Design a protein around this ligand. Structure first.
Ligand SMILES: *[C@@H]1O[C@H](CO)[C@@H](O[C@@H]2O[C@H](CO)[C@@H](O)[C@H](O)[C@H]2NC(C)=O)[C@H](O)[C@H]1NC(C)=O
Ligand SMILES: CN[C@]1(c2ccccc2Cl)CCCCC1=O
Ligand SMILES: *[C@@H]1O[C@H](CO)[C@@H](O)[C@H](O)[C@H]1NC(C)=O
Ligand SMILES: *[C@@H]1O[C@H](CO)[C@@H](O)[C@H](O)[C@H]1NC(C)=O
Ligand SMILES: *[C@@H]1O[C@H](CO)[C@@H](O)[C@H](O)[C@H]1NC(C)=O
Ligand SMILES: *[C@@H]1O[C@H](CO)[C@@H](O)[C@H](O)[C@H]1NC(C)=O
Ligand SMILES: N[C@@H](CCC(=O)O)C(=O)O
Ligand SMILES: N[C@@H](CCC(=O)O)C(=O)O
Lengths: 392, 278, 406, 91, 132
């Protein structure tokens, strides 16, 4: 976050006291997107920064923190004719720094030039995709053709009553309409008990017609709902879609970092690696912002960063299965005398349970009609019929 | 071999699905139990304190089993009121289970299917009874040669539906121009398992008719023919052959359990009930 | 090297009686006379086999006897650590857990499998959520329908005035239609008035039909429940609480006890009396009912919760792990072997071979709800709604003895 | 699921004079469908299958106890009449 | 469905919920016990035999909400019998050769084939599966 007007760090608090610790932090501002600029003081704080202050207590430090120059993590590359390191690792081997406290994934290429101590946490690699929204549900279980056919059935069967009431060897026509309408709707309106066997023998099963039709109704919603389950979800690596892209499914990662190293050293993982070279994003938030805009179907990136995002936006859901278990770590040169004491003092944090407290503070605890109008849709019926009833 | 793939035909067609819960045994005997208990009330309510007879004994008693909303004439006297009340407890359960079972029967439905095989009358008779039924295949190939030798009657009619290639035929399926495709099986199964929407299926759940196989053609009486075949047989032994197809010939549209994805019931499904009053 | 015996990682079996040697896919484990040359295999050993090949050296196995793992007794050690510490052997592979007390006197490689302290408990015989006022469409339809009935009842009364049929009597009819029937009422005789009731019914049947079907959804899927949140839960922290106290009994002599004895001293006062000599004999106690909790490693329990007892034995938190720490290979703190094998282990994670070994040995069967033949009395969702309904009835009842009295 | 696919064949001694003049009749019989007729008359016929997983055709085997409660209520009716009969004169 | 305790809890509930109607209207500025016995037993069982409705401005509110109580009991009863008629029989069926039971033998399972047949050749030639 940028500084205040006079340069002092802004002040906040947690849910209960415990002031958030902050430290002055220098580095580039506009990320140099072709328009380089000088460094201006800023404020740096959070989970990793909360680790230095604990580390500075038992080791007698006077530390100053400056952000990276370019932005990338680090990767070997050949320049116009040797091999060198860009990103952070260029700065650690060039003597501009002595210790790296940031999310670094330890790997084979990096271990040959710097050591790593012992991990903060453990994680893997997952995929991030958008969600799918379900459907109101009023006229769900029937089709358009059904209503107009069952609806015409009541009147065509009601009239059969009257014909059987004027040839008896005590029902009027108006009451017959009510009795036919009532049984299906399950409502005690008036009295429509008929006489004579023939007129009654229809009334034996006519009520039973209400049973089956209504019975199937509840059957549908039980069937339709629990069995909706749209056929979806990407099941991690080795999915047929990933091995054979159809160019309608674009998936890319962050430039440099580690995933590029992973999908390059494996020879079989060459078809996808060719395709993603044209879509790599040079950030860790633009790609996330891109996925929410449906401009990028999939996204491969680190688990701890991705899982927190899913629990904060309530709009993106992870998937798949973890397939590269590698911890983070703290880096320093092959000759520093802090190798032994730094790595030992991380272990006495897991044993003492300290690293659980930082988890609670910084990661975990940030979890994120038509039928009704149908009752009101019939009000105009009385208004049109208000005068008609008066006339008759 | 030779297979046939057709559209999903939307939801399955399951006529006479209403009667599936319970069985004919209870229905044929449940009804007579009402008549007995209706007579009992006449004996039960005969004494003490208005002419409730067997004429209306059924009508009141028949009303409850089919839910309610049946205007009736109640009996009288505390002697008989107990019987009709305990009869109601029999009405709730019969209703409660029947609904709680029809849906439980409908979820585990099975897909209807349309035609069985090339021997079906629909294929044999192109338009004799049903409206013009549509099918065709790509010529120049092998499946056409098999059709000509053994089914000479249907090879004349199906000349006016020739496609040109596998892709161009598939689009004509979705648009409804064509609704039956007869092509080599090793291509259809891969194609029908890697399509968006999973709306295409092979009849018979993997049905083939004239089983042959692929192979590597070699010049006649060549010295290599003894060694090539032995090499292929070895690939079965170490399982290399049995995992390559997991790399090129897999899909996502699982053809298991015959997933229906709702039925969206129509007029046709409830045909009998519109007949029962008839 | 030096190893021990563990069920899924490094397993010891007797030699072939006929040949007198070890079957293929095994390495000869001596069992320090030094008699009865045994055979050993497993997931851990296959790691040793590859590392010997890639780096290149000659090795012979050696099973420890003096104790199991480290426990500082008056400034001297035992077990695997008790042997690497005394130059008797260089490497010590197997089931070894990195900790602060051990990285002082020996070094460790980069861990290759995650572990930790986790809890294991027997599954219930069947359970389901109470879900008071089982959610039809969330607590929003409850608010809106209440106004709608009052809104329409005035509309009914509006046509009543055009025609005693008071509001209190007439509203009652408008409501009993929703909750099925069999509540005697008084329908009005207004011909154009009775029509709106018919449309009102169509709201009732659809609403009632929709509700019963949808409620089957929340009790057809289910996701079980959880019990005892974690280590810091009060059910553990104060064992001397009321009711039959729970039983923990972690196996002694290891990190799974040395951790607790430095962070929860009041825990260790009470857990002591319920010890178990070994691992397997603890599980039968758990299934019989002698114990009700277990504190051990994560890889061992999760594997042991997925082989045969995965039918009804699970781990709290759906696999939650506390104070995470990995396994690893010991060294001599100067053995200069650290640099090559450290690269080798990270090399294996580079490609995907560790997973291939992981899914060959540490595989599973089980992991999903039961029939729930209970409908237990613990529902209380509407019974509480019943009692709270009684109270509101009596509150307005006092108006009978007040308005008339005043 | 099927995990090692091969096929029964007709085996002969190597380099017999029928090596190539038999495997035409096996191979030609597939086109005529003659191999199909032998299949449906010696392999597949009537059976009891999975019938998917679980039907529902309730009957006496499970639905009979409720029919006893109304039967149980039949007897209690006779008892209730006599007590009802006598209590009228007690007033 | 349900459970023995609930029915007896319900059976005790109807009597205790019916009586307080009489105590409510009788001491308040036309009902009888049999009606109260009948009315409560009526709604739960859904029968029209119940005749006498309460006549006051305090009995209805208790009575009306009790009409709500009849919805849950029956509706739950239907919604639970569906559970026993859709839940399939639990069993861990053998899945191919990849199952860990095949790879890691146990004394519970016994494996049989036909002697000197093709399966014997197929098995006793692959070292990795040369385990059972
Ligand atoms: C855990 O370590 C203790 C430390 O000695 C062991 O305790 C002794 O056990 C042996 C018998 O196994 C006996 O000497 C005594 O009963 C114990 N005390 C002493 C002073 O020796 C204990 O055996 C170890 N636990 C296991 C399971 O091996
Ligand atoms: C007709 N009875 C229904 C019902 C279902 C469940 C419980 C009681 C009842 Cl009354 C009401 C809603 C439509 C479906 C149905 O079976
Ligand atoms: C280092 O830290 C110790 C205690 O943490 C303190 O006494 C000492 O003054 C610090 N500085 C030096 C130079 O030792
Ligand atoms: C590391 O910590 C130990 C702890 O006693 C201390 O003696 C040693 O001097 C520390 N090393 C450095 C380089 O400060
Ligand atoms: C198929 O064969 C016919 C003649 O046998 C030929 O004219 C035609 O070009 C071939 N291909 C197609 C696609 O029809
Ligand atoms: C091979 O088959 C042909 C069939 O046309 C037959 O004429 C010939 O005699 C056969 N030869 C032998 C050696 O069987
Ligand atoms: N599989 C066939 C396709 C042509 C046909 O179906 O006849 C071939 O390769 O020739
Ligand atoms: N063997 C390790 C892990 C197993 C356990 O904690 O019991 C130890 O003794 O600490």
């Amino acid at each position: 976050k940028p500084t205040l007007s006079d340069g002092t760090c802004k002040e906040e608090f947690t849910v209960n006291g415990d002031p958030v610790k902050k430290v002055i932090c220098t580095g580039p501002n506009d990320t140099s997107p072709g328009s380089p600029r000088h460094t201006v003081p800023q404020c740096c704080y959070g989970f990793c920064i909360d680790l230095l202050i604990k580390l500075a207590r038992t080791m007698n430090f006077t530390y100053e923190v400056h952000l990276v120059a370019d932005g990338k993590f680090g990767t070997q590359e050949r320049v116009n004719n040797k091999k060198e390191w860009n990103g952070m690792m260029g700065e650690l081997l060039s003597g501009q720094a002595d210790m790296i406290v940031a999310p670094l994934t330890i790997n084979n290429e990096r271990a040959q030039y710097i050591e790593f101590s012992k991990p903060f946490k453990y994680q893997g690699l997952t995929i991030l995709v958008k969600k799918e929204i379900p459907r109101d549900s009023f006229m769900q279980p029937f089709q358009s053709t059904l209503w107009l056919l069952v609806g015409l059935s009541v009147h065509v069967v009601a009239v059969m009553l009257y014909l059987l009431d004027r040839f008896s060897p005590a029902l009027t026509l108006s009451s017959a309409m009510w009795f036919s309408w009532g049984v299906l709707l399950n409502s005690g309106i008036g009295e429509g008990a008929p006489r004579s066997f023939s007129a009654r023998i229809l009334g034996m099963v006519w009520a039973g017609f209400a049973m089956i039709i209504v019975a199937s109704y509840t059957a549908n919603l039980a069937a339709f709902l629990v069995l909706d389950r749209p056929e979806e979800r990407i099941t991690g690596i080795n999915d047929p879609r990933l091995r054979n892209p159809s160019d309608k499914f674009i998936y890319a990662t962050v430039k440099q970092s580690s995933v590029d190293i992973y999908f390059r050293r494996q020879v079989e993982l060459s078809t996808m690696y060719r395709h993603m070279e044209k879509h790599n994003y040079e950030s860790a938030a633009e790609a996330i912002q891109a996925v929410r805009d449906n401009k990028l179907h999939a996204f491969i990136w680190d688990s701890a960063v991705l899982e927190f995002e899913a629990s904060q936006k309530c709009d993106l859901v992870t998937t798949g299965e973890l397939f590269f278990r590698s911890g983070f770590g703290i880096g320093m040169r092959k000759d520093s005398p802090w190798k032994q004491n730094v790595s030992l003092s991380i272990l006495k944090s897991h044993e003492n349970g300290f690293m659980e407290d930082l988890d609670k503070t910084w990661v975990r605890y940030q979890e994120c009609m038509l039928v009704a109008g149908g009752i009101v849709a019939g009000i105009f019926l009385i208004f049109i019929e208000i005068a008609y009833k008066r006339h008759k | 071999g030779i297979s046939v793939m057709v559209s999903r035909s939307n939801g399955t067609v399951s006529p006479s699905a209403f009667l599936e819960p319970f069985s004919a045994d209870v229905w044929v005997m449940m009804f007579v139990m009402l008549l007995i208990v209706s007579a009992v009330a006449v004996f039960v309510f005969e004494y003490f304190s208005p002419s409730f007879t067997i004429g209306k004994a059924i009508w009141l008693l028949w009303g409850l089993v089919f839910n309610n909303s049946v205007p009736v004439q109640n009996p009288k006297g505390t002697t008989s009121k107990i019987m009709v009340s305990v009869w109601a407890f029999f009405a709730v359960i019969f209703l409660a289970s029947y609904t709680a079972n029809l849906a439980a029967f409908m979820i585990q439905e099975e897909y209807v299917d349309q035609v069985s095989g090339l021997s079906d009358k629909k294929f044999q008779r192109p338009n004799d009874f049903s409206p013009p039924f549509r099918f065709g295949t790509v010529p120049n190939g092998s499946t056409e040669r098999n059709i000509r030798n053994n089914y000479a009657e249907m090879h004349a009619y199906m000349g006016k539906f020739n496609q040109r290639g596998v892709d161009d035929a598939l689009l004509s399926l979705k648009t409804g121009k064509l609704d039956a495709f007869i092509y080599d099986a090793a291509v259809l199964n891969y194609m029908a398992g890697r399509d968006e929407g999973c709306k295409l299926v092979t009849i018979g759940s993997g049905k083939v008719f004239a089983s042959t196989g692929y192979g590597i053609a070699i010049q006649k009486d060549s010295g290599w023919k003894r060694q090539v075949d032995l090499a292929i047989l070895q690939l079965f032994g170490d399982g290399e052959m049995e995992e390559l197809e997991a790399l090129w010939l897999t899909g996502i549209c699982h053809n298991e359990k015959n997933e229906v994805m709702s039925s969206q019931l129509d007029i046709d499904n409830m045909a009998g009930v519109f007949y029962m009053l008839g | 090297v030096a190893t021990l015996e563990e069920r899924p990682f490094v397993i010891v079996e007797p030699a072939d009686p006929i040949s007198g040697t070890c079957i293929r896919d095994s390495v000869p484990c001596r069992s320090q006379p030094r008699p009865e040359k045994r055979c050993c295999k497993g997931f851990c050993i296959d790691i040793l086999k590859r590392l010997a090949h890639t780096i290149g050296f000659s090795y012979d196995l050696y099973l420890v006897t003096n104790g199991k793992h480290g426990k500082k007794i008056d400034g001297v050690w035992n077990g695997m650590i008790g042997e690497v510490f005394y130059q008797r052997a260089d490497m010590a592979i197997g089931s070894l857990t990195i900790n602060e007390e051990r990285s002082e006197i020996v070094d460790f490689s980069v861990p290759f499998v995650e572990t930790g302290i986790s809890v294991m408990v027997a599954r219930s015989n069947g359970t389901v959520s109470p879900s008071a006022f089982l959610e039809p469409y969330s607590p929003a339809v409850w608010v809106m329908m209440f106004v709608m009935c009052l809104t329409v009842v005035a509309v009914t009364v509006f046509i009543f005035e055009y025609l005693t049929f008071t509001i209190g009597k007439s509203i009652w009819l408008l409501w009993a239609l929703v909750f099925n029937n069999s509540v005697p009422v008084e329908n009005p005789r207004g011909t154009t008035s009775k029509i709106m009731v018919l449309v009102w019914a169509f709201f009732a049947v659809i609403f009632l039909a929709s509700y019963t079907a949808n409620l089957a959804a929340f009790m057809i899927q289910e996701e079980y429940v959880d019990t005892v949140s974690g280590l810091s839960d009060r059910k553990f922290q104060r064992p001397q609480e009321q009711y039959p106290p729970l039983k923990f009994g972690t196996v002694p002599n290891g990190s799974t006890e040395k951790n607790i004895r430095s962070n929860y001293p009041d825990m260790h006062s009470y857990m002591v009396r319920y010890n178990q000599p070994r691992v397997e004999e603890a599980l039968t106690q758990l299934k019989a009912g002698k114990l009700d909790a277990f504190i051990y490693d994560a890889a061992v329990l999760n594997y042991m919760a997925r082989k045969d007892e995965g039918c009804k034995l699970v781990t709290i938190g759906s696999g939650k792990v506390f104070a995470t720490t990995g396994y690893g290979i010991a060294l001599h703190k100067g053995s200069r072997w650290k640099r090559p094998i450290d690269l080798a282990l990270l090399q294996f994670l580079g490609d995907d071979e560790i997973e291939m070994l992981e899914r060959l040995w540490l595989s599973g069967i089980c992991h999903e709800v039961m029939s729930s033949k209970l409908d237990i009395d613990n529902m209380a969702g509407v019974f509480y709604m019943l009692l709270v309904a009684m109270g509101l009835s009596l509150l307005v009842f006092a108006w009978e003895h007040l308005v008339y009295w005043r | 699921e099927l995990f090692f696919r091969s096929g029964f064949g007709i085996g002969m001694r190597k380099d017999s004079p029928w090596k190539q003049n038999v495997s035409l009749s096996i191979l030609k019989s597939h086109e005529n469908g003659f191999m199909e007729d032998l299949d449906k008359t010696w392999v597949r016929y009537q059976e009891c299958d999975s019938r998917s997983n679980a039907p529902a055709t309730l009957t006496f085997e499970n639905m009979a106890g409720v029919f006893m409660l109304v039967a149980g209520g039949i007897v209690a009716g006779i008892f209730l009449i006599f007590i009802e009969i006598a209590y009228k004169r007690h007033k």
